[PDB]
């Protein structure tokens, strides 16, 4: 302390002010992270989309594995299956399913 000279600019805050600071600086620190969250996705986030759509864990993995092979992640593995079913006039499941076995990716790229 050292500590003593570093807290100099803190000495005159009130307990409410010191708390308020703590928290506003907390928010300032995690805000960037929150953003990363809005603007990006990951294999787990995508697989979790598929899970919620009616697909299995094994299936979800295969669909995402092939979505990454096509740099397509940027669109959304759930998205792909959707456009894919609304295009061929098929069941959300049959579409997704088909994609798990490397079908309709030709179509997906356009």
């Amino acid at each position: 302390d050292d500590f003593q000279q570093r807290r100099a600019h803190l000495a005159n805050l009130s307990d409410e002010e010191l708390q308020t600071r703590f928290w506003e600086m907390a928010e300032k620190i995690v805000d960037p992270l929150l953003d990363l969250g809005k603007k990006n996705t990951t294999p787990s986030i995508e697989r979790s989309v598929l899970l919620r759509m009616g697909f299995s864990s094994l299936e979800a993995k295969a669909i995402v594995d092939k979505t990454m092979d096509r740099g397509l992640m940027g669109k959304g593995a759930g998205h792909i299956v959707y456009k894919i079913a609304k295009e061929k006039n098929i069941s959300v499941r049959e579409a997704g399913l088909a994609l798990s076995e490397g079908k309709y990716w030709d179509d997906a790229i356009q």
Binding site: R21, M25, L51, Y82
Partner: protein, 728 residues
């Protein structure tokens, strides 16, 4: 369907029809305060609603077996590797007051890049899968109906499949979970970008589920060289996961700080931990406090752990705990046994109840040394944030090794953990979303362009697909087993035999383990080994010395050992036989007065023995209201009787200590005869006792009862009321 208190939980029946199980309830539940509650003789300032079926503290027997329940929700940790055994321990624990059952995952499930399926054998924990979860939660549904108070199912949304597990938990009604992206990075070395992006998704899902979230701060205690210096760091982590969660859209009342008092004796622990405890709760007004028990400075003595855990409950009571987790007092000695989960649960229920309304009579000296340290710690926390901000925010802080440092911040020993913002499990598995990125599901976090399909569905992205599994449970894909060898039904069969034989267990059905406590008159190493020999010669397999305490370097050592019992026993093969209370004895003599003459008889001066069953001191008949007329010692047999007659006594008690030449039986016989001669023998009770007396040999002499070594008053009194009835 059903459950009877005297009928074991049918696990086989639970493993059945799992593909069609749903939860009964969704969300976390708190306990209902029961204000000014009356139970037995007492009124309770800080109790919640009582259970309909429970096991009271042993000593409750002296208060009508009341089993009052404290305000804070109580946790216990049950995860043996085999969930199917664990469910039974759950029932056990729930009856001892637990309403929060937390299941640690299989060793490093954090590293599994997706869900697992089925029921492989866990390692240092249960492998969390949809099957095993549906099983346990189905079971708990049953158990909570039995005890009569909703139970909270809990586990870990961590690692690289956070989002995955969050969905599974949400669907299958898991009521609480750990989630803290900070954990992932510091201790599991998972890419910091990947995990903070995942957390948003997970936390959003958990938000949907109205799940209680516990954080990871406590792991900082564990990693720290000296936990009494890690508090400023503690307050930052807590702060970071809380604001983050809050912002994602969680309720402040669902965000729980996982907070363990940092020190334990011989350290001045209340003195050290209390001001931090107070600071923490001042800074996070509004948030939930999940109090957990110390495991760092814990050893192999279960006693030690229990005492320190009581000081942990004191810390919660001087401040606040919305949730109070517990640690088995054997956590430092082995993997938790059934009996020590229940020890924990008793201790916590016990101390807290004992501390009922204690803050009406005690309070914090907030203005003094306490207040000063509280401010000091808050300031070290604030500084800590400033320096994170000042170096480019979270990521650079972690890289520059701000975390896990053994110094007392702002003091920096430069030995923290440093993570690459670009290294770790899952580095470069972060993808940018494009203008047209979409996800047609409920509870999704980031940019979701649905407007490209319907401006009106922006608030209902599930409507794109007529509901997601969160709205259409049926759509969920159930998988039962993947591995035909490593599963529960293969495990349930290697032991179906024991479902009419029996043997002792500690964690898993019939594992044959038991505990051995002894003391040996030699030093510690010699005694450690002698201990093992004795254990061996008792027919024990797999003998381990698990605890060693030095009574004195030379006078002796306590040893504790576990081992295996190689046999079973047939319930059928045991012969098992099939009692007046002190209140029954008292009542009978209260109603019918009862008068005695007593004496040490003959040429005997030994008086202590008779008086030992009369004086109220050690439970003598005086206690029950018997009218004792005491003649003294060296009283003549003829005299004893004459008095019994003069005083119209109901019984004669005679003490017969000297036993030379059967003089003791000889006088017993002279008394019977003397009564007969005087025609009162049929109207009187005659009891005689002494060191060399054998009750049978004394009845053969003609007297009604005989008492020797170890006679207490309850015995003699039980004999006076019983025999008296028998004569009317």
């Amino acid at each position: 369907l059903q459950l009877r208190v005297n009928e074991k939980l049918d696990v086989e029946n639970i493993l059945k029809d799992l593909d069609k199980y749903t939860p009964k309830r969704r969300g976390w539940t708190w306990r209902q305060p029961a204000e000014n509650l009356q139970m037995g003789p007492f009124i309770y300032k800080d109790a919640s609603t009582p259970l309909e079926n429970s096991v009271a503290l042993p000593s409750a027997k002296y208060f009508g077996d009341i089993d009052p329940q404290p305000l804070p929700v109580i946790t216990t940790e049950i995860a043996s590797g085999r969930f199917e055994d664990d469910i039974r321990r759950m029932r056990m624990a729930a009856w001892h007051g637990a309403d929060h059952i937390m299941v640690i995952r299989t060793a490093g499930q954090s590293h599994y890049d997706g869900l697992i399926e089925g029921t492989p054998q866990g390692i240092g924990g249960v492998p969390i899968t949809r099957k095993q979860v549906r099983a346990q939660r189905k079971a708990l549904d049953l158990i909570e109906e039995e005890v009569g108070r909703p139970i909270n199912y809990h586990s870990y949304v961590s690692g690289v499949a956070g989002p995955d597990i969050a969905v599974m938990f949400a669907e299958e009604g898991v009521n609480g979970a750990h989630q803290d992206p900070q954990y992932n990075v510091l201790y599991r070395n998972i890419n910091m970008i990947r995990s903070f992006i995942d957390a948003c998704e997970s936390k959003t899902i958990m938000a949907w589920a109205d799940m209680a979230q516990i954080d990871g701060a406590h792991n900082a205690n564990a990693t720290a060289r000296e936990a009494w210096k890690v508090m400023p760091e503690l307050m930052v982590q807590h702060a970071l996961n809380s604001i983050f969660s809050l912002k994602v859209g969680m309720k402040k009342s669902n965000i729980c700080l996982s907070t363990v008092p940092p020190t334990a004796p011989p350290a001045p622990s209340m003195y050290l931990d209390l001001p931090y405890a107070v600071a923490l709760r001042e800074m996070f007004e509004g948030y939930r406090m999940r109090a957990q028990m110390n495991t760092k400075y814990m050893e192999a003595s279960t006693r030690e752990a229990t005492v320190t855990h009581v000081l942990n409950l004191l810390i919660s009571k001087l401040t606040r705990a919305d949730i109070q987790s517990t640690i088995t007092p054997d956590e430092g000695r082995n993997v938790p046994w059934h009996i020590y989960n229940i020890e924990a649960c008793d201790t916590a229920k016990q101390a807290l109840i004992g501390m009922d309304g204690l803050m009406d009579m005690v309070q914090l000296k907030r203005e003094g040394v306490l207040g000063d340290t509280v401010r000091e710690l808050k300031e070290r926390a604030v500084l800590f944030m400033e320096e994170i901000i000042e170096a480019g925010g979270y990521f650079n802080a972690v890289e520059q090794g701000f975390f896990v440092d053994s110094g007392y911040y702002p003091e920096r020993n430069g030995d923290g953990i440093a993570r690459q913002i670009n290294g770790g499990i899952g580095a470069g598995t972060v993808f940018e979303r494009d203008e047209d990125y979409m996800a047609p599901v409920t509870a999704h976090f980031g940019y979701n362009n649905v407007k490209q399909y319907d401006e009106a569905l922006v608030s209902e992205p599930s409507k794109l697909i007529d509901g997601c599994t969160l709205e259409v449970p049926e759509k969920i894909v159930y998988i039962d087993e993947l591995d035909e060898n490593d599963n529960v039904n293969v495990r349930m069969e290697e032991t179906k035999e024991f479902r009419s034989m029996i043997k002792p267990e500690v964690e898993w059905q019939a594992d044959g383990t038991v505990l051995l406590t002894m003391f040996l008159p030699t030093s510690k190493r010699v005694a450690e080994f002698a201990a093992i020999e004795f254990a061996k010669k008792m027919n024990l397999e797999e003998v381990e010395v698990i605890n060693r305490e030095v009574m004195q370097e030379a006078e002796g050592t306590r040893i504790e050992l576990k081992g295996r019992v190689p046999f079973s026993i047939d319930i059928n093969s045991l012969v098992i036989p099939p009692i007046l209370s002190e209140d029954e004895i008292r009542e009978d003599i209260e109603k019918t007065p009862l008068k005695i003459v007593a004496a040490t008889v003959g040429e005997d001066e030994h008086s202590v023995g008779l008086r030992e069953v009369i004086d109220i001191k050690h439970g003598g008949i005086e206690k029950y209201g018997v009218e004792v007329h005491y003649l003294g010692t060296s009283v003549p047999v003829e005299k004893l009787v004459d008095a019994a007659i003069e005083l119209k006594a109901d019984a004669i008690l005679a003490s017969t200590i000297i036993s030379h030449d059967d003089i003791h039986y000889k006088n017993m016989k002279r008394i019977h005869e003397l009564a007969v001669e005087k025609g009162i023998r049929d109207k009187i009770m005659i009891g005689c006792g002494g060191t060399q007396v054998t009750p049978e040999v004394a009845v053969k002499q003609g007297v009604d009862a005989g008492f020797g070594r170890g006679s207490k008053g309850i015995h003699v009194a039980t004999f006076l009321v019983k025999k008296r009835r028998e004569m009317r």
